[PDB]
Write an enzyme that holds these catalytic residues in place. Structure first.
Site, PDB file in Angstrom:
ATOM      1  N   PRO A  37      40.391  55.534  -4.559  1.00 24.17           N
ATOM      2  CA  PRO A  37      40.236  56.781  -3.811  1.00 24.17           C
ATOM      3  C   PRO A  37      39.016  56.661  -2.924  1.00 24.17           C
ATOM      4  CG  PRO A  37      40.913  57.337  -6.023  1.00 24.17           C
ATOM      5  CD  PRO A  37      40.758  55.835  -5.924  1.00 24.17           C
TER       6      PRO A  37
ATOM      7  N   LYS B 132      41.171  57.449 -11.992  1.00 20.90           N
ATOM      8  CA  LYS B 132      41.113  56.069 -11.509  1.00 20.90           C
ATOM      9  C   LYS B 132      39.797  55.471 -11.979  1.00 20.90           C
ATOM     10  CE  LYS B 132      45.068  56.300  -8.723  1.00 20.90           C
ATOM     11  NZ  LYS B 132      45.780  56.213 -10.028  1.00 20.90           N
TER      12      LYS B 132
ATOM     13  N   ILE C 208      45.878  56.994  -3.308  1.00 21.66           N
ATOM     14  CA  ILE C 208      47.226  56.518  -3.548  1.00 21.66           C
ATOM     15  C   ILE C 208      47.722  57.303  -4.743  1.00 21.66           C
ATOM     16  CG2 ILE C 208      48.735  54.628  -4.119  1.00 21.66           C
ATOM     17  CD1 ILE C 208      46.540  52.764  -2.789  1.00 21.66           C
TER      18      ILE C 208
ATOM     19  N   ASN D 114      40.159  67.728   3.608  1.00 28.85           N
ATOM     20  CA  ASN D 114      41.502  67.284   3.895  1.00 28.85           C
ATOM     21  C   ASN D 114      41.931  66.286   2.815  1.00 28.85           C
ATOM     22  OD1 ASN D 114      40.547  67.067   7.366  1.00 28.85           O
ATOM     23  ND2 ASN D 114      41.855  68.639   6.421  1.00 28.85           N
TER      24      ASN D 114
HETATM   25 CL   LIG Z   1      40.714  63.558   7.211  1.00 27.67          CL
HETATM   26 ZN   LIG Z   2      42.795  63.668   8.030  1.00 29.63          ZN
END
Ligand SMILES: [Cl-]
Ligand SMILES: [Zn+2]
Ligand SMILES: [Cl-]
Ligand SMILES: [Cl-]
Ligand SMILES: [Zn+2]
Ligand SMILES: [Zn+2]
EC number: 5.3.2.1
Lengths: 114, 114, 114
Positions: A1, A32, A64, A97
């Protein structure tokens, strides 16, 4: 990550140990191993949130898998809590995000994770 | 919405008021309240476009909805216009990545927008 | 194509000519004309990979097409090779996010590529 935080908070206001704390807590949250977690903090940025330049953060988490409605709510609680406690950023001035990546679409070690 | 511009234009060439202008113009263009618009400008970058280090910009707009063929054309005219007028960057040396985000994949205020 | 590299390697360790080398080799790898290749290198970053502050890189490649399992493996070999040879970064401390963009979601020259 991979977790990235961009902020207008100055460098001197990022405490010692912050990258390690992010690494540890994201390993715990994503499940993870810490060896696979990457973190990046970018202070001193020219940014505004809702028209004002009080402390704020624009962030991303690529993983992932381990991305989804309930997981992302849990990540956001964790990460906003860290940004508030360590960087004094209000949670309502943070965007994160979340990007769920296919293994074939992440390069590493001269190949991909496919 | 979140708008980021990375550019090799120097910091001193970024006008006072540019973040506010971006905020207002994006609120108007997306139809979303200014309170939800985040903007971030990163000058002085080591970048090239077509192998040239003349002024250029690499940008992104993330939004929950309000992303599509016609809308993106409109956003590109608006944003290239602003970059040309304010930063003196030619429109043919700008890229803008548009990302339509699902509400469950945007963190904010200890949760997501879902 | 747009290639971004963020790294903790210092600016003085990024050799002269590196942006041009990236541009040339990406044009070849992707098949795209050099005029459409954009590159961006960000040194001196506060980052960790696996909890470690040894040299590392967090990267992305956006392209309209030319993304897929075999292509991405090829890109990763190319790009990790360059980061190893030029920046002395181990390939196992590099992540590259690959994003296949729709033409309608890439702004350029006052419009999009659709
Ligand atoms: Cl982003
Ligand atoms: Zn983005
Ligand atoms: Cl982007
Ligand atoms: Cl990315
Ligand atoms: Zn993108
Ligand atoms: Zn990405």
């Amino acid at each position: 990550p991979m977790f990235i935080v961009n902020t207008n908070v100055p460098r001197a206001s990022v405490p010692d140990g912050f990258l390690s704390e992010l690494t540890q807590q994201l390993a715990q949250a994503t499940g993870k191993p810490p060896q696979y977690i990457a973190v990046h903090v970018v202070p001193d940025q020219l940014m505004a949130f809702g028209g004002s330049s009080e402390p704020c953060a624009l962030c991303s988490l690529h993983s992932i898998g381990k991305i989804g409605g309930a997981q992302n709510r849990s990540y956001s609680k964790l990460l906003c809590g860290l940004l508030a406690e360590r960087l004094r950023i209000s949670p309502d001035r943070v965007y994160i995000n979340y990007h769920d990546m296919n293994a074939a679409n992440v390069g590493w070690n001269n190949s991909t994770f496919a």
